Design a protein around this ligand. Structure first.
Ligand SMILES: C[C@H](Oc1ccc(CN)cc1)c1cccc2c(-c3ccc(CS(C)(=O)=O)c(F)c3)c(C(=O)O)[nH]c12
Ligand SMILES: [Zn+2]
Ligand SMILES: [Zn+2]
Length: 231
């Protein structure tokens, strides 16, 4: 019942965590440049179907995610959104697409994924190209806060439950560093976080791209660690 960590997640298996009624996170682990990392995604019930947010970081992890969803929830995943272009968000899109899931991302994410050699979601999400933009997608709202962890990062809000999924633009409270910042805009990131804070002041659960969910404090903490990283 505690939030899963790598010490309970061998690379290749996936765990789900119930966040609220009809909202789960998914947690998987992956190795990258010789270190092991956890990463989160989201599952949101969409009537008798499910909307998936982000892959489980890899083809085999994403196959394991689909099997875990079938075991624990038993409703079909019909659509998936990837919230930026890195492999913890799109790696596994080919698995999803061969399992009949329609895969979506912003045009910016699709272009960056293609240029990087990462898997490419099929469908483009328009209406998200300017910071502050929001669109509805099934039971969620997608929001583009501006450049942060990456120039294309999206956040996801579940209005029925006041769940804010920040993705990799939001870090967990225990973080001491701003993660992998190679594609980040450290100067713009606090402004983008401020936009999230202004847009979703009633969020009750905030889920980072990696690590433990918490409350709204994750947003200010993220701004703090980014500003200190920059400096
Ligand atoms: C999936 C991502 O791939 C790449 C990212 C950039 C590039 C540049 N061409 C190439 C590959 C990736 C690969 C490996 C690690 C990461 C991390 C990361 C790193 C450290 C922490 C602990 S912390 C906040 O306390 O420092 C953390 F939570 C997350 C993140 C993220 O920050 O989103 N992305 C990661
Ligand atoms: Zn990333
Ligand atoms: Zn990440």
């Amino acid at each position: 019942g505690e939030y899963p960590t790598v010490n309970e997640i061998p690379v290749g298996e996936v765990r789900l965590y119930q966040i609220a009624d009809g909202v789960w996170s998914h947690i998987a682990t992956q190795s990258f440049d010789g270190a092991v990392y956890p990463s989160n995604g989201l599952i949101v019930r969409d009537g008798d179907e499910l909307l998936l947010i982000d892959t489980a970081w890899g083809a085999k992890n994403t196959a394991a995610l689909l099997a875990e969803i079938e075991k624990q929830i038993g409703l079909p995943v019909t659509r998936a959104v990837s919230t930026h272009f890195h492999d913890d968000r799109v790696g596994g899109v080919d698995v999803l697409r061969a399992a009949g899931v329609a895969t979506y991302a912003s045009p910016s994410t699709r272009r960056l994924a293609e240029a990087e050699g990462n898997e490419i979601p099929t469908h483009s999400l328009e209406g998200l190209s300017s910071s502050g933009d929001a669109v509805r997608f099934g039971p969620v709202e997608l929001f583009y806060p501006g450049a942060a962890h990456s120039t294309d990062n999206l956040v996801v809000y579940v209005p029925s439950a006041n769940v804010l999924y920040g993705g990799c633009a939001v870090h967990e409270l225990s973080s001491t560093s701003a993660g992998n910042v190679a594609d980040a805009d450290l100067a713009e990131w606090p402004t983008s976080v401020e936009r999230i804070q202004k847009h979703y002041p009633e969020a009750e659960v905030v889920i980072p791209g990696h690590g433990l969910p918490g409350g709204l404090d994750l947003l200010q903490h993220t701004a703090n660690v980014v500003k200190a990283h920059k400096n």
